[PDB]
Structures are given as structure tokens and as C-alpha cells.
Amino acid sequence: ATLNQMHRLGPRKEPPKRLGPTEGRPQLKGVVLRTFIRKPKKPNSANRKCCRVRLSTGKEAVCFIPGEGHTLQEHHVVLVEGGRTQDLPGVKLKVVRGKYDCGHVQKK
């Protein structure tokens, strides 16, 4: 672009930073609604443990539960955090182990 064209337009317009599943917040608190299994998109093979939750904002999201074995059930309370599960498409939230009803993984 010419110097006249750079002057008439100025600095590049910056698209706004749209928020993610946590809505620009470190964590959210949600109530478990259902516990189910999700299948990782190929080339991976597993039965990943997930749960649906109703977040404090009022929306409902799918959250991956990390660790080997959880005791979560419906009506439990959990603290979710950000971070996508790479193989699980659409799962953009995770549960925090050791907060509210969710507990630390039982060591073997």
C-alpha cells in the first residue's frame, strides 16, 4: 500500500477476542446432569469418561473427567476448568479433581 493509503486506513483492524467455554473466567461451578462415554475420533481408540453439567451461568456443557476412575453421579457439584480434550471433539471443558464432590484419583 502507498503512504497515502496507509494514512487513510491507519492500523489494521483487530477482530475481537471471542470468549470460550468458561466465558473468560478461570473456573465455573456446575451440577452434573448425566454421565456418559464419548468415543475419540480416529486414529485413537478408547471409552473416554465425560459428563454433562449445568454451569453457574445457566448453560449446559460437556466436560471431560480426567484420571483413572471417578465416583461422579447426577446432582453432584464440580468445578470445571478450561482446556480442550484433543481427541474428543466439542469437549472444551474439564473437571477439577479434588474440589467439591469430585475427589482426587485413588492412588494404586
Partner: protein, 113 residues
């Protein structure tokens, strides 16, 4: 004989319109530095000026004097002088009529007409 408050005590511009009665719309331009590019560009402003004799024509360079009291909401200047008349320029250096970069009357001659 206190002078005007406005910063533009004296402004030069081009008469871009003359459709209001006894008023000439004048476009002045100033140089403003682009901070990113550090280059000067033309910022233009519009000034309404009182043309008492309706002696202004579109395209002529004029000098405006700030009025002591604003005549109206937008008329805060008067026509001090017509520096260059449109198509009827008179060379300041020699005083002879010119039509562009040429003399309609040679400076060697002394017509005195």
C-alpha cells in the same frame, strides 16, 4: 477593539461555495503530522465568511479575518482580501496579469491601461 477568541485570527482558503446570501463557504487546509508515518498530510476545515459585497466566486483564494463577535452560529469570519481571483490572477512579483505559468501582459512592457 478586542480581537476574537477563535484561534484562527487569520485563515487562507479556497471559496468552495457561494450559495448563501452575503456569505462565502471557504475551505482552508493545514498540514498535520501523521505520528506513525511522520509525514504531513492536508487537514481541511470549512469557514463561513461574511462577504458584504458578494464579490466572491467559487475557486478563488481569499483571506478571512476573525470577527470580534460571531455574526451567527457559523459565521465568525469576514472577507479580508481576495488573494487570487479565479482565472484573473495578478502576479504579485511583477504585477502583470497572468494565465497560469505565463504572462498575459509582458513585464517588459508598460501598458498603464
Amino acid at each position: 477593539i478586542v480581537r476574537s477568541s477563535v484561534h484562527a485570527k487569520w485563515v487562507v482558503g479556497k471559496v468552495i461555495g457561494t450559495a448563501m446570501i452575503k456569505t462565502a463557504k471557504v475551505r482552508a487546509t493545514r498540514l498535520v503530522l501523521d505520528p506513525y508515518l511522520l509525514k504531513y498530510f492536508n487537514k481541511r476545515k470549512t469557514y463561513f465568511a461574511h462577504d458584504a459585497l458578494q464579490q466572491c466566486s467559487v475557486g478563488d483564494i481569499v483571506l478571512l479575518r476573525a470577527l470580534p463577535v460571531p455574526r451567527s452560529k457559523h459565521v465568525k469570519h469576514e472577507l479580508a482580501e481576495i488573494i487570487f481571483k479565479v482565472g484573473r490572477v495578478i502576479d504579485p512579483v511583477t504585477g502583470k496579469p497572468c494565465a497560469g505559468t505565463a504572462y498575459l501582459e509582458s513585464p517588459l512592457s508598460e501598458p498603464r491601461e
